[PDB]
Amino acid sequence: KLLYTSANFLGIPTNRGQPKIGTYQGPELIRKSNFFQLVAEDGIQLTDCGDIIPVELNEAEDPQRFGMKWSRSFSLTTLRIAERVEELMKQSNKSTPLVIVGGDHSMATGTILGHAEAKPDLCVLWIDAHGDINTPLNSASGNMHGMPLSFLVKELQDQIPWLDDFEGIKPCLNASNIAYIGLRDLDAHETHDIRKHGIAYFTMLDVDRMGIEAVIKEALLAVNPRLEKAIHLSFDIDALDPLVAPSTGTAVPGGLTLREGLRICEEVSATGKLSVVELAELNPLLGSQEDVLKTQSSAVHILRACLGHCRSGHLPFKVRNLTDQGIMSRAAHMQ
Amino acid sequence: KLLYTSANFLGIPTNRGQPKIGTYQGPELIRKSNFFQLVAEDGIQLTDCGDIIPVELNEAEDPQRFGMKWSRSFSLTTLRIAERVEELMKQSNKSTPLVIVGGDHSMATGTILGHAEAKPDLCVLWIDAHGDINTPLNSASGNMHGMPLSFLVKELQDQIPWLDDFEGIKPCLNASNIAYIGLRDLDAHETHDIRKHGIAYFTMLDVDRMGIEAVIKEALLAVNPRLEKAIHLSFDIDALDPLVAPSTGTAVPGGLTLREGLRICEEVSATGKLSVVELAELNPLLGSQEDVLKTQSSAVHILRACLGHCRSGHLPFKVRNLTDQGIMSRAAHMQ
Amino acid sequence: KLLYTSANFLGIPTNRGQPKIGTYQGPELIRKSNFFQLVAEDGIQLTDCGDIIPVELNEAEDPQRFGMKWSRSFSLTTLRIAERVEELMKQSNKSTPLVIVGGDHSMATGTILGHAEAKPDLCVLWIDAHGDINTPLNSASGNMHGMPLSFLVKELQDQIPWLDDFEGIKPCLNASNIAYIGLRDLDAHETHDIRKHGIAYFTMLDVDRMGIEAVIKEALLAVNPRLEKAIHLSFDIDALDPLVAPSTGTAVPGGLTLREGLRICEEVSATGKLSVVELAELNPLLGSQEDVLKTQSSAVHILRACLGHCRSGHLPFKVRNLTDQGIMSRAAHMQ
């Protein structure tokens, strides 16, 4: 009756991928919610595997290199994440999805690296207002959370500066293994690289013209045609409209409705191939108390959909009967 | 020019169907609005028939029975509502719609009972995030507003515990006479009963995949194929997204847009078969002042659509002419 | 690579078309934003042409005439606007769009008058919750911002009272040159005139049933079939849902989503025929600080779309290369 009967939960409180303090509280925002209770109510055994501890160096240890901010904290954290995800995914070999809560999106380099170590032929569905595929010299901001895919994509490696501490970060993705949904604020050089190397992408313009149902279908068609590959679903909460997810660092108006977001996750879940889902860029320190509650709520509904929650309802495990308790029913009484 | 030239208005301030104080202020929230003025401006004669006084017993008189909270207050209130609705609907036999403002949704047992007494072959369109069809032993909450349909549906009576004071509450609905729109938070046993007895239902997943236009059509097709039956439209305000109706007790993210809600009401109205519309679960004591204003506004637009308001405009009753006032026009002056 | 490489920007702080103080701050709300910076980042040369100074008479000089409030301030302002727009549009003869920020919508009589002087065969796309086509004796409010089209439409001139100071305001539009999108709160006499004279209109009901893609297509088909005519896009910010544009004087629930608004502007822009776009009814003195920020944001995204911003991204003018800086890439290092 369930596609996934077990799941693992991992927190990754990354906060050195971008300058706004608070993404480190992301995992706790979800733990404080009713997520676990709701998942159990659906019959799923969810194991909290704790948090990864990011490496956070001081300024002296981690100066700017090629404009990148905290790049050694990044490289060390990436390797620590990858090791943990790899070992979690290998104990998993009905499959057992890994649910990851961030943390800023710089964590994705590590999670995908480790995931691909366990499952080399995976595909990536990237749900985001942003491309997150800036190579270091093209990044105006120097924020690592805008670069995580660039280190992973083989076709881009002539645009990545060599750093010794980045050697263990091996490019494990082909451009043909990635599909974007939700884009609406690409940098020019991202647009260039995406089009040049033929990365499948469906922006909010595409969602408007095609509808989310067709977009989801085409995205899966592009990178997982016959559902042969494990899916890495990388969900940036800022893919959703700021009206439903205001508490995040780089919000952009005109996003996915919660319903559109749910449809993406419902379809990905229903493939039976959801291997890892990560939810990035929750920041409970941004916005009002009600803003945080809305963002939390949206996140929980999204993550539930990923694990197979159905808005059309679930059947009970044991159907209750009235006579079993020795109780007279109205139907019984009338006869 | 008008499908309905007259209408009746009834308040039912039920608040013993659920524990949050404030649904009793629902009718006043609408009376305080510009609803009446706007309805008159469309040429409709709307008569305020006052409020039904719910029976509210004290704890000693109304202890828990079969887990139900305030079940004798419920049974007595149900009978009082039914008597009033029946007499209102029988004076009505262009038909004259009855507009009912709640009050929590437990009132629906009474309104439908009385309605069916006047019009036995009616159908029910239930617009709600919830099923409201829990039988008493399956209800974790014991809140009557989550059970009103269960006492009315004939196929469910082997699951209703017999109570003497419930005898006058006769099941008057076949499962085939009900269609849901907007569901997104069903209890497992509700899901079971709905599927088992073939109740037509269109959840938010269905709305996403089909679109609201097709959903409305299919819902009417399922329970009123040739528009032969009077329609009881039971509209829970929490069917709408919390962004447009935050002031309600059990809000669930990812609801109908106001526009989707308007389309439901516009189509139901246009059948010429709208016999009763009830609007449930307004709670002006929940949320901020602006939250209440939004919910009020959404409710007024919804109720106006039910009575035939057209967003594409109405024609004037008397067309004004310039020369009638003895005034020189620009066209006149240029000649 | 760009449809429009240059554009002009004009502020018109009209505030005598309606009684709520604050629309005069509209132009500054946009100047304070990052609009100019973002437009430049797309490669467009935008020239700020300053503000038009409206004529604002005192009460003694400008008493009510035919129920109209501030009608001489209106007639004088209209002529001053028209002169300025005409001279701006004639210096413009890749064309150079004129972007106008209001100001209440009464400015439209002046902007269209001047525009048509430069381009007599123009068409008008009116994006609004309201018709703004009340003739003076039918207007209950007397607010000029609800009448600007009535003075321009030739077919309506037998319903316009003659005033000497209105002589220079010559009707320059045929009813067949106008198409509405977004209507949802028409006055009865507006509905009458619109239907009587066959003005193309697509209300929110039409948007719901047809979808915005079809609506845009049909609107352009109705008034600009072969893209032969210059387009005057008159965008009332209250066309958008109050959830995304709360800071405006006459907000009506159930409006266009920001995305739907963007699609309108994206398609109009892509015709290559966008000649003038005006954005009306911004009022930074209404609503909360966050309300103003949302409205500002929505306005900037809308105006950017008009000038050709693409949500699917732009290509860089110069593609950056790694070796040009004398830097070793990862690809280089591995060989």
Ligand SMILES: N[C@](CCCC[B-](O)(O)O)(CCN1CCCCC1)C(=O)O
């Ligand atoms: N691409 C940006 C944003 C990165 C956000 C990372 B995410 O998706 O985890 O929140 C810069 C975006 N860009 C900035 C200026 C104007 C256009 C968009 C960057 O800093 O590289």
Ligand SMILES: N[C@](CCCC[B-](O)(O)O)(CCN1CCCCC1)C(=O)O
């Ligand atoms: N079905 C619920 C909600 C009833 C709401 C009545 B309405 O539609 O008038 O507002 C309980 C819902 N349920 C609770 C736990 C998790 C799943 C949903 C119940 O209490 O029976």
Ligand SMILES: N[C@](CCCC[B-](O)(O)O)(CCN1CCCCC1)C(=O)O
């Ligand atoms: N049509 C109205 C609104 C004008 C708004 C001008 B805009 O689009 O620049 O904001 C009156 C609307 N009308 C009022 C009563 C009920 C129905 C709608 C008027 O005052 O003429």
Ligand SMILES: [Mn+2]
């Ligand atoms: Mn992002």
Ligand SMILES: [Mn+2]
């Ligand atoms: Mn991201």
Ligand SMILES: [Mn+2]
């Ligand atoms: Mn409900």
Ligand SMILES: [Mn+2]
């Ligand atoms: Mn209900």
Ligand SMILES: [Mn+2]
């Ligand atoms: Mn308007």
Ligand SMILES: [Mn+2]
């Ligand atoms: Mn207007």
